Every structure is written in C-alpha cells, then in structure tokens.
Design a protein around this ligand. Structure first.
Ligand SMILES: Nc1ncnc2c1ncn2[C@@H]1O[C@@H]2COP(=O)(O)O[C@H]3[C@@H](O)[C@H](n4cnc5c(N)ncnc54)O[C@@H]3COP(=O)(O)O[C@H]2[C@H]1O
Lengths: 175, 178
C-alpha cells in the first residue's frame, strides 16, 4: 500500500516546498520574456503512462522555456535544483494556452513497480494505488488552501487529446 | 496511514535506480579534475537517522563533516519536467582535524517527510516506527537489486557518539573488505 507514502512524500517534499514561490517565478519570467495562469498544472494519468518529454508525444503540446530555477541546500545536498517547464497548448496550430505543466512523478513510480520483475505489483494493483494516491493527496490539499489554490489537479484515464483535456481545465479556471 | 512502504519504493525507483548507474562515471570525472588525499569509494553513502533529525547542512550534525566540492551535475528530462537536475555533494570526514575519509554523502531525504508528519495523530514513536520500516523495506529492495546494493551504503543510526566516526567506520570497512 504505497499510495499513502507517495502522497505525503509528494506533498511534504515538493508541493508545499515549491508552490509558495511559484507565482513570483512566473511573474519574473513574464518580466523578461505571457503566462496568465499562475498555478502548477499537474497531470494525473491513472494509466500511469508518464513519458519524460511532454511535447515529444503530442503535436499540440510545445515546450516553451524553463522557469527561473529555484536552488536550495537539501538534506546534505548543496544547491539541490527545482525546475519547472512552461508549455504552450495548440489548437489548429496557433497558441491556445500557456501554463507551467508537468506530470505527477509518483505515478511513474507506480508504473515502474508494475514493470519490476522482483515485485508482486500487477496492473490491477497499480490502478488501485493510482486512485488511492490521488485521493490521499486531494485530502491533504483540502486542508491546505494555499497550496490547493496554487496548483491544478488534472486527473484522467486514457482509453483522446491531452492538449484538449488541459485546455478544458484552463478555460474553467478563467471563471 | 502507513507511509514507510511508499517512501521506500519512491526512494529506490525515483532516485537510487536512476542515480547509481552513472555515479562512478561522475566520481571519476571529479578525480580527473581535482587533487585529493582520491575518491576510491564509488558508493553513495546515505545517512539514515532513525530519529529523523535531518538538518540541511551536514556541518550542523557534526563539524567533522566538511563539504569539499560538488560532483558534476547531471541533466535529464523526466515526468514532463525538462532538464531535471541531479546534483550530489562530496564531503571529507575529519579525524583530529585532518581528512581521514572522502566520499559522496547525504541524508535519506524522505526522512524529512516522516519528521514533518510528526509536527502535524502521528507521534514520534510512530515516526520512529515508520523510519525503521522505511529502512528494512528499502534493504529488502536493495537485497534483490545487485547493481544498487553495490553502489550505495546505508548508514543507519539512532541518536541518543560521533556521526563522523560512524561514517569513517563504514568507509574503513568498505576499504578493508575482502
Ligand atoms: N526537483 C523536482 N522536480 C520534480 N518533482 C520533484 C522534485 N523534487 C521532488 N519532487 C516530487 O516530490 C517527491 C519528493 O520526495 P522527496 O524529495 O522527499 O524524496 C525523493 C528524494 O529523496 C530522492 N530524489 C529524487 N530525485 C532527487 C534529486 N534530483 N536530488 C536528490 N534527491 C532526489 O528520491 C525520493 C523520491 O523522488 P520522486 O521523484 O520519486 O518523488 C518526488 C517527486 O515526485
């Protein structure tokens, strides 16, 4: 039952660490190089298919630029680096949305566990933990309104246009 | 409400399995660019305080752990994040003020997650209970992983003692092992 650990790890060791300073980094980027939405948009594919490059697997998702990095001495690691990536969403091939976008890496852990031969993780076990991971994280954010307001949770299950799914969320947020 | 199994598989799949294959190449890159004693221990040494006291700067834990230099930083695309950076730090361990050992050294960062969970029904004895379960679950994973069990060393201790002397014992054991 790894979902409970993955969710608290994801929240303690990343979300509540990176979300406070995200708006200022987004503002800094708009000063030099716009990005209307100032939330981290996290993708939650329950199939746990997490490619390393987002834009390489979709013509309507295009990498734009890195945000200004955020460095910190972390647990004996001097200058641990946290980078987030700006992507533009394309509709008929002409910018439709721009936002800081990434996957929820804990799902990548669930997938690799399902592929590990030295483990008893089945694709049914993974989908069970994938839902339980999302629910646990959502329960944490429900009592953390600042972090909850500083990110967007995009939960879906591919049987589809990911760029359309993302743009649907961006248009809902504009209200 | 058990988190140790999640922390263990997260630490292995999301870090060790990714960072350990190329650690030796990074270390030999360092040895060719700097003079030492050089780094003859190619294992990542991971401090595992069961009390979950994880300061960010190792010199707070013991001034006889002195930061030397960073390893070559690595860049990779992962989980939709472009150029996620992987960086590790080299420390020298002092004996009578003089360098007696050099290695790549850090804390097991997920132990901070266990600590923050104890601040805010998660007591410190549940925290200590989860840390031990974190340790032994990870050791079972390393037990079935020949490559990673050879490229890293967990240093497991409970603080009631010289942490620098604890590390030097592992390094001396590793160097004198048949
Ligand atoms: N810079 C970053 N970019 C994107 N996402 C980030 C991030 N830092 C943290 N996260 C997210 O939050 C989790 C953090 O867990 P934590 O850092 O306590 O515990 C981490 C950490 O102790 C170790 N680890 C992974 N990558 C590392 C790195 N570049 N440097 C040092 N330690 C790392 O492995 C554990 C599991 O990492 P995993 O990626 O599975 O899980 C990560 C990841 O999903």
């Amino acid at each position: 039952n790894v979902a409970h650990g993955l969710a608290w790890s994801y929240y303690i060791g990343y979300l509540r660490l990176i979300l406070p300073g995200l708006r200022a980094r987004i503002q800094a980027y708009n000063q030099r190089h716009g990005i209307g939405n100032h939330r981290l948009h996290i993708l939650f594919p329950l199939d746990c298919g997490v490619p390393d490059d987002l834009s390489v697997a979709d013509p309507n998702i295009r990498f734009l630029h890195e945000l200004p990095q955020q460095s910190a001495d972390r647990a004996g690691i001097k200058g641990r680096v946290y980078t987030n990536s700006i992507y533009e969403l394309l509709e008929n091939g002409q910018p439709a949305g721009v936002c800081v976008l990434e996957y929820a890496t804990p799902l990548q852990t669930l997938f690799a566990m399902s592929q590990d031969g030295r483990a008893g993780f089945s694709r049914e076990d993974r989908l069970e933990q994938a839902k339980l991971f999302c629910r646990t994280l959502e329960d944490i954010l429900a009592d953390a309104p600042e972090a909850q307001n500083n990110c967007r949770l995009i939960v879906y299950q591919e049987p589809f246009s990911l760029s359309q799914e993302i743009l649907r969320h961006l248009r809902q947020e504009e209200r």
